[PDB]
Structures are given as structure tokens and as C-alpha cells.
Amino acid sequence: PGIVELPSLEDLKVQEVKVSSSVLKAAAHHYGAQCDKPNKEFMLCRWEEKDPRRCLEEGKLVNQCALEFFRQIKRHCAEPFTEYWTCIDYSGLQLFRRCRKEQAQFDKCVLDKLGWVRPDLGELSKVTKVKTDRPLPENPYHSRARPEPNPEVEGDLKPARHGSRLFFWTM
Amino acid sequence: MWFEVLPGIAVMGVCLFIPGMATARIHRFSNGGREKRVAHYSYQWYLMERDRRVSGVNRYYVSKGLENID
Ligand SMILES: CCCCCCCCCCCCCCCCCC(=O)OC[C@H](COP(=O)([O-])OC[C@H](O)COP(=O)([O-])OC[C@H](COC(=O)CCCCCCCCCCCCCCCCC)OC(=O)CCCCCCCCCCCCCCCCC)OC(=O)CCCCCCCCCCCCCCCCC
Ligand SMILES: CCCCCCCCCCCCCCCCCC(=O)OC[C@H](COP(=O)(O)OCCN)OC(=O)CCCCCCCCCCCCCCCCC
């Protein structure tokens, strides 16, 4: 067949969000609140193109907007966030429910210094709409032309010409 | 009298207390002073292997926070 095209290693260099999973899980509700638009443009491009090579730049925007999400935490509320993700980080299942007062301190300092409202129960699971400028893929599966169907039956049904025509049976 | 059965019950209770306290102290020792990560589900395993990558020292439990980003 053909050669599969791959992007170069410079096309894959972006500054990584090099924080732990409890750090990501601690700020995840405010992350889904504040980093909505580039994340949803990326996941729309990712379910529509069905190809990650066509989804690099939007992904870079994700990694552009996540870092600016954490810098904006690090400039303002580094200590209550640190006290919060440490308590998230203790738990083996990483329970939100074991960590409600540290969550309250982090949410208080974030609403005071950044004005961010934490999403409620049922908001980040909504199907939202995304206004992009990229065109709709007319053939995301790269499917070739389908075979033409067999001709259907038409014409009025006539009797059998002289019956069964089986050796001597005249009907 | 009836308190003569209590030394054997206390010895058997220490023998039942040893495995739980043992596995609690060992899980705190081997995991950076914290609980062992429970990975029943593949998302938990993905986050745990991503922690092992982002720690830089090949350990999932070495946590990196805001100080790791600029
Ligand atoms: C206005 C609206 C109202 C109008 C009303 C008008 C009518 C009023 C009268 C009402 C009664 C109508 C009767 C039926 C129509 C005429 C049937 C007919 O003569 O067919 C000729 C038919 C072929 O002749 P034709 O010149 O081509 O057609 C003239 C007509 O246009 C025949 O028409 P066709 O050209 O369209 O023929 C079609 C085609 C013509 O046939 C073919 O193209 C060839 C294929 C035939 C089958 C061959 C099978 C061979 C191997 C098996 C042999 C079995 C053993 C032999 C019998 C042992 C005893 C059971 O038929 C078949 O293929 C069907 C199979 C044959 C059925 C015949 C009727 C049987 C009814 C009585 C059953 C009693 C036993 C009869 C004999 C059984 C064996 C056939 O003759 C035969 O096949 C030979 C058998 C004799 C005919 C049966 C006569 C019926 C009356 C019998 C009275 C006596 C009974 C005595 C006691 C019982 C016996 C022990
Ligand atoms: C998780 C908890 C598990 C706990 C398990 C154990 C429960 C029981 C603990 C021990 C209880 C006390 C046992 C005392 C036994 C009798 C001691 C004694 O005095 O024996 C005397 C005998 C002969 O003495 P002799 O010198 O000949 O006397 C002449 C004196 N003019 O001298 C002898 O027979 C020699 C000395 C024998 C001493 C044996 C002591 C018991 C050994 C049991 C094995 C397990 C020990 C504990 C293990 C876990 C902790 C490290």
C-alpha cells in the first residue's frame, strides 16, 4: 500500500503539564470551568477528524491553556491549592469526600482572588456546542465508492408462460 | 474464673491485629508515606502510570505540584 505519514518531533514539542494526577484531580472542576473552549474545540476536532495527526495544534492549545490555568493558580493561591492536593494525594482512591475543608479553602481563595465559581453537580457532563472555523470532514473514514446495488423488481406480475414447464405438466 | 480465658483471647487478638497493622505500615512505607494507589479501573492505572512518568524518578508516588511548572 502506501507510506503512513507521521509528523516530525518538532511538531510534537509542547511544554508539558508536569504535575501529578492528584494535582490535576484537585483543580479539575475549575479546570473544566475555565478551560472549556480550547478543550472542547480539541475534543470536537478529535471525534470529527478521527485522526490525532489532524488534532495536534488544537491539542497544543489545550496544553497552552492548561499551563496558563496553573500559572494563574500559582500566582495567587499556591498554598491553599497545595494544602488541598496534598490531602487528595494521601488517599489511595483519591477521595474528594475526605478533603472537603481543604476544598473549601481552595474554593474560597479562588472565588476571592480569581472570581471562579466551581461547577455544580451535573454541569461538566453536559453536551455543549462548539463554534469552530475548520470545515466538516466530508469523508472521515476515507471510504471508497460503495458498490452499486442490484436492480430492484419492477413491472406488473404476469402468469407463468404455459405453467411450470416441468416435462409434461401443462400447468 | 471467666477471666482466665482472656489471656488466650488477647494472644489470638494480637495475632489477628498483626496482619492489618503490618500491611498498613508497609503500604505507608512503600508509597511515600501515603496509602497505596488503588487501580481497579484503567483510568486509575493510566493516571498512576502518568504519575510514574511525570515524577521523573520512576515512582508513581513521588508527587509533583505547582513547583514543577514554571
Ligand atoms: C365456468 C366455470 C365452471 C366450469 C366447469 C367445467 C368442468 C365441469 C366438470 C367438473 C369436473 C372437472 C374434472 C377435472 C378437469 C378435467 C381433468 C382431466 O380430464 O384431465 C386430463 C388429463 C390430461 O389430459 P388433457 O387432454 O391434457 O387435458 C384435458 C383437460 O383440458 C384437462 O385440463 P388441463 O389441460 O388444464 O390439464 C391440466 C393438467 C393435465 O395433465 C398434464 O399436463 C399431465 C400430468 C398429469 C399427471 C401425470 C402423473 C403420472 C404418474 C401418476 C399416475 C397415477 C396412477 C394413475 C391413476 C390411478 C388411480 C388414482 O393436470 C395436471 O397436471 C394435474 C394432474 C392430473 C389431474 C386430473 C384430474 C383428476 C381428477 C379426478 C381424480 C381421479 C383419478 C384421475 C387420474 C389420476 C392420475 C392423473 O388426463 C390425465 O392426466 C389422465 C388422467 C385422467 C384425467 C382425470 C379425469 C377426471 C374425472 C375422472 C372421473 C372418473 C373417476 C373414476 C374413479 C377414480 C379413479 C379410480
Ligand atoms: C503474637 C503473640 C504470640 C505469643 C505466643 C507466646 C505466648 C506465651 C508466652 C510465654 C508465657 C510464659 C511461659 C513460661 C513457661 C515456663 C517457664 C519456666 O519457668 O519453666 C521452667 C522450666 C524448668 O526450670 P528449672 O530451671 O528446671 O526449674 C528448677 C528451679 N529450681 O524451664 C524451661 O522449661 C526452660 C525455659 C522455657 C521457657 C519457654 C517460654 C515460652 C516459649 C514459647 C515460644 C514463643 C515465645 C513468644 C514468641 C513471640 C515473642 C518474641
XYZ file of C-alpha atoms and ligand atoms in Angstrom:
392
model
C 0.000 0.000 0.000
C 1.260 3.450 0.982
C 3.570 5.129 3.469
C 1.855 6.302 6.651
C 2.663 9.984 7.152
C 3.872 10.999 10.614
C 4.692 14.486 11.932
C 8.228 15.338 12.960
C 9.455 15.550 16.540
C 9.413 19.358 16.420
C 5.695 19.200 15.590
C 5.196 17.296 18.865
C 7.170 19.564 21.208
C 4.975 21.483 23.629
C 5.541 22.450 27.251
C 4.038 19.589 29.240
C 1.753 19.897 32.238
C 4.218 18.095 34.507
C 2.014 17.765 37.578
C 0.677 14.687 39.305
C -2.749 13.109 38.944
C -3.869 14.326 42.360
C -2.820 17.840 41.341
C -4.900 17.523 38.170
C -7.782 15.992 40.110
C -7.725 18.746 42.745
C -8.151 21.574 40.231
C -10.232 19.534 37.776
C -13.578 21.248 38.367
C -12.128 24.738 37.976
C -10.127 23.404 35.013
C -13.283 22.205 33.276
C -14.909 25.514 34.158
C -12.177 27.874 32.962
C -10.521 25.860 30.164
C -13.793 24.954 28.436
C -13.390 26.393 24.942
C -9.958 25.049 23.768
C -10.614 21.646 25.358
C -13.955 21.330 23.585
C -12.531 22.573 20.269
C -9.904 19.856 20.623
C -12.349 17.088 21.518
C -14.681 18.155 18.723
C -11.752 18.043 16.278
C -10.740 14.709 17.797
C -14.118 12.980 17.411
C -14.654 14.532 13.979
C -11.287 14.080 12.260
C -10.826 10.603 13.865
C -7.092 11.214 13.428
C -4.698 12.651 16.045
C -2.309 13.972 13.383
C -5.044 16.420 12.378
C -5.528 17.344 16.044
C -2.074 18.491 17.108
C -2.484 22.273 17.107
C -5.800 22.247 18.990
C -4.095 19.877 21.420
C -1.286 22.409 21.784
C -3.958 24.977 22.630
C -5.087 22.581 25.366
C -1.521 22.446 26.609
C -1.353 26.207 26.165
C -4.475 26.812 28.222
C -3.806 24.260 30.953
C -0.429 25.789 31.866
C -1.961 29.272 31.981
C -4.602 27.690 34.214
C -1.938 26.546 36.660
C 0.214 29.697 36.494
C -2.904 31.648 37.432
C -3.214 29.315 40.416
C 0.487 29.607 41.237
C 0.496 33.411 41.176
C -2.483 33.721 43.536
C -3.476 30.660 45.580
C -0.450 28.349 45.706
C -0.715 27.495 49.411
C -4.445 26.525 49.720
C -4.181 24.569 46.473
C -1.080 22.792 47.784
C -2.794 22.001 51.090
C -5.720 20.683 49.039
C -3.949 18.425 46.541
C -1.780 17.014 49.338
C -4.949 15.802 51.072
C -6.291 14.485 47.759
C -2.894 12.846 47.255
C -2.989 10.953 50.569
C -5.998 8.832 49.621
C -5.491 5.619 47.684
C -8.723 6.127 45.753
C -8.186 9.930 45.814
C -11.464 10.751 47.517
C -12.955 14.187 47.104
C -15.104 13.397 50.145
C -12.181 13.107 52.575
C -10.954 16.606 51.694
C -13.882 18.998 51.996
C -12.356 21.679 54.224
C -9.235 21.982 52.061
C -11.584 22.142 49.073
C -13.453 24.917 50.858
C -10.251 26.876 51.487
C -9.156 26.469 47.862
C -12.608 27.402 46.516
C -12.812 30.413 48.849
C -9.413 31.743 47.805
C -10.140 31.076 44.123
C -13.539 32.822 44.219
C -11.989 35.758 46.080
C -8.817 36.248 44.054
C -9.990 34.977 40.644
C -13.800 35.096 40.721
C -14.148 31.483 39.595
C -17.311 29.582 40.506
C -16.867 25.832 40.870
C -19.171 23.786 38.596
C -22.152 22.141 40.221
C -23.303 18.534 40.153
C -24.217 17.859 36.532
C -22.527 20.686 34.667
C -19.235 19.315 33.331
C -21.084 16.284 31.919
C -23.208 18.479 29.634
C -23.121 18.169 25.865
C -22.121 21.678 24.784
C -21.842 23.229 21.338
C -18.571 24.391 19.814
C -18.178 27.177 17.256
C -15.082 26.466 15.155
C -13.963 27.655 11.730
C -12.466 24.384 10.486
C -14.562 22.580 7.852
C -16.581 19.426 8.315
C -14.747 16.278 7.104
C -16.618 15.008 4.055
C -15.087 11.517 4.365
C -13.554 10.913 7.797
C -13.287 7.162 7.193
C -11.538 7.613 3.798
C -14.125 5.231 2.388
C -14.038 4.404 -1.302
C -17.082 4.244 -3.570
C -19.733 1.800 -2.427
C -20.747 -0.945 -4.881
C -23.886 -0.269 -6.857
C -26.956 -2.142 -5.579
C -28.680 -4.860 -7.550
C -31.628 -3.800 -9.744
C -34.924 -3.942 -7.886
C -38.066 -5.649 -9.163
C -40.439 -3.646 -11.344
C -43.191 -4.481 -13.769
C -46.601 -5.997 -13.194
C -46.640 -9.691 -12.363
C -47.772 -11.819 -15.330
C -48.752 -15.504 -15.160
C -46.209 -18.186 -15.905
C -45.894 -18.844 -19.638
C -47.535 -22.270 -20.046
C -47.203 -23.127 -16.376
C -44.397 -24.961 -14.624
C -42.796 -26.180 -17.898
C -41.784 -29.313 -15.978
C -41.519 -32.160 -18.535
C -45.220 -32.641 -19.329
C -47.166 -30.807 -16.635
C -49.145 -28.281 -18.656
C -49.982 -26.142 -15.614
C -12.983 -17.768 86.844
C -14.227 -16.488 83.495
C -11.344 -14.004 83.146
C -8.932 -16.943 82.749
C -9.972 -17.244 79.079
C -8.841 -13.666 78.381
C -5.044 -14.288 78.035
C -5.651 -16.731 75.177
C -8.202 -14.384 73.600
C -5.739 -11.493 73.920
C -2.935 -13.524 72.311
C -5.250 -14.549 69.462
C -6.323 -10.914 69.127
C -2.720 -9.749 68.795
C -2.217 -12.463 66.161
C -5.221 -11.083 64.288
C -4.038 -7.477 64.760
C -0.573 -8.114 63.260
C -1.512 -8.627 59.536
C -3.649 -5.486 59.283
C -1.289 -3.118 61.098
C 1.566 -4.772 59.194
C 0.075 -4.173 55.756
C -0.887 -0.617 56.764
C 2.672 0.259 57.825
C 4.161 -1.473 54.776
C 1.810 0.340 52.387
C 2.685 3.639 54.046
C 6.392 2.795 53.838
C 6.498 1.716 50.185
C 4.349 4.543 48.816
C 5.910 7.742 50.128
C 4.179 7.999 53.485
C 0.710 7.513 51.994
C -1.871 4.930 51.001
C -1.212 2.504 48.186
C -2.854 3.638 44.974
C -5.917 1.561 44.170
C -6.099 0.830 40.441
C -9.186 -1.281 39.843
C -10.046 0.590 36.660
C -7.982 1.504 33.620
C -8.374 5.249 34.157
C -6.797 4.834 37.598
C -3.960 2.848 36.024
C -3.488 5.499 33.340
C -3.243 8.275 35.934
C -0.885 6.156 38.028
C 1.461 5.457 35.106
C 1.297 9.134 34.170
C 2.347 9.927 37.752
C 5.232 7.476 37.361
C 6.285 9.303 34.198
C 5.904 12.878 35.497
C 7.742 12.149 38.748
C 10.981 11.648 36.827
C 12.299 9.112 39.356
C 10.246 6.110 38.093
C 7.899 6.125 41.104
C 4.177 6.842 40.894
C 4.061 8.132 44.458
C 6.580 10.978 44.083
C 4.131 13.836 43.631
C 4.846 16.973 41.607
C 2.759 20.093 42.113
C 2.834 23.747 41.057
C 6.583 23.977 41.678
C 7.199 21.655 38.715
C 5.610 24.046 36.217
C 7.075 27.494 35.587
C -67.444 -21.791 -15.825
C -66.733 -22.306 -14.586
C -67.032 -23.764 -14.286
C -66.634 -24.717 -15.397
C -66.781 -26.189 -15.041
C -66.241 -27.123 -16.112
C -65.952 -28.535 -15.632
C -67.177 -29.327 -15.217
C -66.843 -30.730 -14.728
C -66.171 -30.767 -13.363
C -65.112 -31.855 -13.212
C -63.762 -31.488 -13.807
C -62.722 -32.588 -13.724
C -61.299 -32.076 -13.840
C -60.968 -31.449 -15.180
C -60.562 -32.461 -16.233
C -59.361 -33.295 -15.803
C -58.837 -34.168 -16.898
O -59.518 -34.901 -17.556
O -57.517 -34.023 -17.069
C -56.959 -34.591 -18.277
C -55.545 -35.072 -18.104
C -54.680 -34.632 -19.254
O -55.488 -34.509 -20.439
P -55.523 -33.241 -21.406
O -56.129 -33.600 -22.706
O -54.094 -32.704 -21.474
O -56.422 -32.109 -20.652
C -57.847 -32.084 -20.881
C -58.494 -31.058 -19.979
O -58.345 -29.755 -20.552
C -57.955 -31.072 -18.569
O -57.461 -29.760 -18.231
P -55.896 -29.370 -18.403
O -55.490 -29.410 -19.822
O -55.762 -27.989 -17.781
O -54.989 -30.399 -17.509
C -54.012 -29.896 -16.571
C -53.001 -30.965 -16.249
C -53.003 -32.026 -17.312
O -52.043 -33.065 -17.020
C -50.832 -32.939 -17.559
O -50.471 -31.967 -18.164
C -50.005 -34.175 -17.359
C -49.733 -34.550 -15.908
C -50.773 -35.490 -15.326
C -50.273 -36.297 -14.156
C -49.448 -37.488 -14.575
C -48.977 -38.339 -13.428
C -48.469 -39.691 -13.860
C -47.971 -40.547 -12.720
C -49.017 -40.882 -11.688
C -50.081 -41.850 -12.149
C -51.021 -42.258 -11.030
C -51.775 -43.544 -11.301
C -52.925 -43.406 -12.282
C -54.273 -43.269 -11.610
C -54.615 -44.429 -10.704
C -55.829 -44.188 -9.856
C -55.663 -42.992 -8.958
O -53.363 -31.560 -14.962
C -52.367 -31.971 -14.159
O -51.208 -31.949 -14.470
C -52.887 -32.441 -12.832
C -52.812 -33.949 -12.639
C -53.972 -34.685 -13.284
C -55.299 -34.430 -12.600
C -56.511 -34.777 -13.446
C -57.831 -34.613 -12.717
C -58.109 -35.714 -11.716
C -59.448 -35.587 -11.013
C -60.047 -36.920 -10.628
C -59.056 -37.844 -9.964
C -59.344 -39.312 -10.176
C -58.166 -40.040 -10.782
C -57.677 -39.392 -12.062
C -56.363 -39.936 -12.593
C -55.180 -39.699 -11.678
C -53.851 -39.677 -12.398
C -53.647 -38.423 -13.206
O -55.601 -36.531 -18.116
C -54.670 -37.208 -17.430
O -53.693 -36.705 -16.948
C -55.022 -38.660 -17.336
C -55.902 -38.997 -16.136
C -57.397 -38.826 -16.383
C -57.953 -37.447 -16.124
C -58.861 -37.343 -14.928
C -60.329 -37.206 -15.275
C -61.167 -36.566 -14.177
C -62.513 -37.230 -13.980
C -62.397 -38.705 -13.653
C -63.725 -39.399 -13.461
C -63.614 -40.897 -13.241
C -63.148 -41.301 -11.855
C -63.163 -42.803 -11.627
C -62.854 -43.217 -10.201
C -61.479 -42.789 -9.727
C -60.317 -43.467 -10.434
C -60.085 -44.882 -9.975
C 1.675 -12.622 68.888
C 1.866 -13.099 70.303
C 2.298 -14.550 70.376
C 2.577 -15.043 71.786
C 2.977 -16.506 71.846
C 3.522 -16.964 73.190
C 2.533 -16.939 74.344
C 3.141 -17.461 75.634
C 4.359 -16.660 76.074
C 5.156 -17.264 77.221
C 4.412 -17.353 78.539
C 5.285 -17.791 79.704
C 5.934 -19.147 79.505
C 6.657 -19.696 80.719
C 6.998 -21.172 80.607
C 7.580 -21.776 81.873
C 8.885 -21.113 82.279
C 9.606 -21.833 83.379
O 9.876 -21.357 84.448
O 9.935 -23.073 83.016
C 10.701 -23.844 83.969
C 11.494 -24.899 83.250
C 12.377 -25.660 84.195
O 13.060 -24.710 85.038
P 14.194 -25.211 86.039
O 15.316 -24.248 85.998
O 14.450 -26.630 85.707
O 13.499 -25.162 87.475
C 14.158 -25.558 88.702
C 14.077 -24.376 89.623
N 14.924 -24.571 90.828
O 12.370 -24.219 82.301
C 12.137 -24.422 80.999
O 11.259 -25.125 80.582
C 13.110 -23.662 80.149
C 12.594 -22.289 79.750
C 11.416 -22.360 78.799
C 10.787 -21.012 78.504
C 9.669 -21.076 77.484
C 8.896 -19.782 77.349
C 7.765 -19.854 76.341
C 8.229 -20.063 74.912
C 7.107 -20.007 73.895
C 7.558 -19.721 72.474
C 7.054 -18.391 71.926
C 7.545 -17.171 72.691
C 6.987 -15.842 72.200
C 7.308 -15.516 70.752
C 6.882 -14.120 70.333
C 7.595 -13.011 71.088
C 9.082 -12.988 70.838
